[PDB]
Write a protein that binds this DNA or RNA. Sequence first.
DNA 1: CACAAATCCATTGACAAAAGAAGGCTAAAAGGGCATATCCTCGGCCTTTG
Length: 51
Amino acid sequence: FGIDMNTDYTLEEVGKQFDVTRERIRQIEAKALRKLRHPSRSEVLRSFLDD
DNA sequence: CACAAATCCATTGACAAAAGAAGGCTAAAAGGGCATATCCTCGGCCTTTG
């Protein structure tokens, strides 16, 4: 994502700095998103949702 | 404190899609040519008319 930097880096350019061919980098993004998906870790972020 | 099964880590292959990138096609927007000559009021202004 683009937090605290002017991008928006993409998977190949990300995995360059981690030496992954973008597949493990996809997996790592997915794992972090799943971890933050948990309640008791994202109740505030839930409140930020508007609906 | 010694040996094998359980499981986070990283690549391969295949590949579906998103992103452009062009090529083509219209419709839309711009440009060009046209060849008889020339309303109503008001008021000066002058022809005619008596």
